Amino acid sequence: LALSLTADQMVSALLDAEPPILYSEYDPTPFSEASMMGLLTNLADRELVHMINWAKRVPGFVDLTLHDQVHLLECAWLEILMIGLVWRSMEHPGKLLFAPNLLLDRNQGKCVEGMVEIFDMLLATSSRFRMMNLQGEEFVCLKSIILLNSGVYTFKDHIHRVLDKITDTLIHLMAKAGLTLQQQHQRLAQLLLILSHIRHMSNKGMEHLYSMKCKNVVPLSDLLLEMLDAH
Amino acid sequence: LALSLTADQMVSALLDAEPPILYSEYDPTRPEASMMGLLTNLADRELVHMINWAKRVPGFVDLTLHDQVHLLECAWLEILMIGLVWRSMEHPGKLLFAPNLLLDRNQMVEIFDMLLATSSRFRMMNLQGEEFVCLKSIILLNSGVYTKDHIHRVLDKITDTLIHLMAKAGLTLQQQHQRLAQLLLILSHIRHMSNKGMEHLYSMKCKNVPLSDLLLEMLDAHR
Amino acid sequence: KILHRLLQD
Amino acid sequence: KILHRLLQD
Numbered sequence: 001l002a003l004s005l006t007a008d009q010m011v012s013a014l015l016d017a018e019p020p021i022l023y024s025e026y027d028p029t030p031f032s033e034a035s036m037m038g039l040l041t042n043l044a045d046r047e048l049v050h051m052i053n054w055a056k057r058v059p060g061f062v063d064l065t066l067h068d069q070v071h072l073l074e075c076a077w078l079e080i081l082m083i084g085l086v087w088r089s090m091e092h093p094g095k096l097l098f099a100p101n102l103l104l105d106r107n108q109g110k111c112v113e114g115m116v117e118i119f120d121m122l123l124a125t126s127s128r129f130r131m132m133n134l135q136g137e138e139f140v141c142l143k144s145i146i147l148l149n150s151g152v153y154t155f156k157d158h159i160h161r162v163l164d165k166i167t168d169t170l171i172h173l174m175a176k177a178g179l180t181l182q183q184q185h186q187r188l189a190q191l192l193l194i195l196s197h198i199r200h201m202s203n204k205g206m207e208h209l210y211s212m213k214c215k216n217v218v219p220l221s222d223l224l225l226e227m228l229d230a231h
Numbered sequence: 232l233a234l235s236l237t238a239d240q241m242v243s244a245l246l247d248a249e250p251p252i253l254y255s256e257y258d259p260t261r262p263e264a265s266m267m268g269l270l271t272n273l274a275d276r277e278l279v280h281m282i283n284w285a286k287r288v289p290g291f292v293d294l295t296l297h298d299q300v301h302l303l304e305c306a307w308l309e310i311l312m313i314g315l316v317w318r319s320m321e322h323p324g325k326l327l328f329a330p331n332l333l334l335d336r337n338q339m340v341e342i343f344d345m346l347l348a349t350s351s352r353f354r355m356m357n358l359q360g361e362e363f364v365c366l367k368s369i370i371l372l373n374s375g376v377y378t379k380d381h382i383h384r385v386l387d388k389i390t391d392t393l394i395h396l397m398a399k400a401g402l403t404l405q406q407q408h409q410r411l412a413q414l415l416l417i418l419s420h421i422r423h424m425s426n427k428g429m430e431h432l433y434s435m436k437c438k439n440v441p442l443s444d445l446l447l448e449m450l451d452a453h454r
Numbered sequence: 455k456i457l458h459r460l461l462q463d
Numbered sequence: 464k465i466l467h468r469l470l471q472d
């Protein structure tokens with residue numbers, strides 16, 4: 001069903017499926033460790049609901065069984081959040097746009113133990129996107145790739161064929177922007193190599209959330225708990 | 232210095248720079264912390280060959296010593312693992328750590344399973360040795376590049392190399408770009424296995440199982 | 455799982 | 464650093 005689509009049809013399907021940019025609490029009160037992580041946890045909890053609806057609107061995802069859908073989301077949910085974050089932070093150099101009313105820098109991350117390392121990695125990825133002039137049509141392809149790829153080897157042939165389709169879509173976007181044959185496969189490679197760091201950031205971030213759960217009180221959502229327990 | 236290389240010259244340089252396949256101290260006489268001891272010893276000796284291998288990777292010598300240290304500290308386990316799954320490619324359901332150390336999941340099980348899945352993925356794609364050495368070189372230069380712009384220029388040269396290989400294999404332009412993508416997406420899973428593996432090693436030193444002194448330096452590099 | 459319900463709704 | 468030594472020569 002997803003394989004019959006053109007590259008243009010693939011783009012339009014992903015763009016229209018884009019989740020909304022949510023907001024944080026509007027209290028403008030110097031953050032503390034618990035208060036900052038609380039806002040992020042609350043924000044991440046609400047974003048997951050829209051991610052799931054986004055995932056089902058990603059071409060080929062409904063063709064997967066319920067359990068296979070669960071696995072892919074459980075493995076990639078933080079990567080998908082982070083790539084969303086760095087994409088929103090793209091036009092804000094040296095800052096992280098978690099929410100439109102929640103724009104943070106690494107100085108604020110210093111008040112949370114170990115947050116700076118992850119902050120610096122996110123800021124580095126964002127500035128990399130900005131240097132590459134990452135377009136929105138490329139972004140939605142990359143994020144879709146993460147969803148279908150990250151958990152594909154910890155179980156599928158249907159997924160690989162959809163992954164091939166997204167690749168065709170990426171090349172089609174680059175050829176549309178007037179890139180040469182050489183510049184196309186070079187940019188394609190550059191984009192996909194960043195997915196390795198997103199994985200790394202997610203893994204390092206997953207440990208942090210695990211230790212935060214053991215330290216009790218930044219109350220984790222029981223949805224987040226199930227997503228976290230999967231790792 | 233190394234940007235004036237053709238695709239075939241790139242392949243030849245990488246191929247001839249390949250490290251040897253070392254052996255373990257495995258003795259079928261002896262009877263499971265023994266396994267990790269053998270793996271720790273094996274990895275310790277492989278690191279020495281990897282360091283000299285990285286020197287022969289085009290562009291790596293051009294980088295400063297401080298940058299060379301960082302890239303290796305971040306990607307050493309990735310390179311060891313991709314080497315493992317490549318050697319185990321012709322051995323379905325088994326991990327060939329050393330020619331005399333062939334292991335299945337029965338004899339950490341999920342780390343093994345992930346390595347086994349990667350190897351079967353390579354076998355399905357029929358990964359060529361020319362494509363493998365490119366991938367291993369990409370990992371070295373890419374894994375720690377985000378902690379001039381010379382490294383990216385070299386990465387693009389390796390990308391041109393991969394495409395040139397797939398073109399000679401008879402793949403269509405579309406087939407080249409798809410295969411290129413498939414190979415690079417595996418590097419995401421390789422990073423994953425490295426991170427999980429690194430965490431396992433982190434808890435092993437605290438439990439004591441005895442780690443090498445070089446390995447302890449590589450391990451503390453991930454804090 | 456809560457994830458099961460959300461994927462079905 | 465052992466890595467630094469071995470990388471030098």
Ligand SMILES: Cc1ccccc1N=C(c1ccc(O)cc1)c1ccc(O)cc1
Nearest residue numbers: 040041043044081082085118205206208
């Ligand atoms: C910045 C950061 C550091 C460590 C772990 C996750 C992490 N990402 C954030 C995050 C990232 C992106 C986003 O859109 C929303 C939240 C996070 C924080 C707390 C949670 O319980 C879940 C996600």
Ligand SMILES: Cc1ccccc1N=C(c1ccc(O)cc1)c1ccc(O)cc1
Nearest residue numbers: 270271273274311312315342428429431
């Ligand atoms: C199989 C595995 C599990 C967990 C961590 C590393 C790991 N890889 C192995 C390994 C992997 C590849 C290789 O060529 C040699 C050793 C390992 C085991 C113990 C060490 O102290 C260092 C490396």
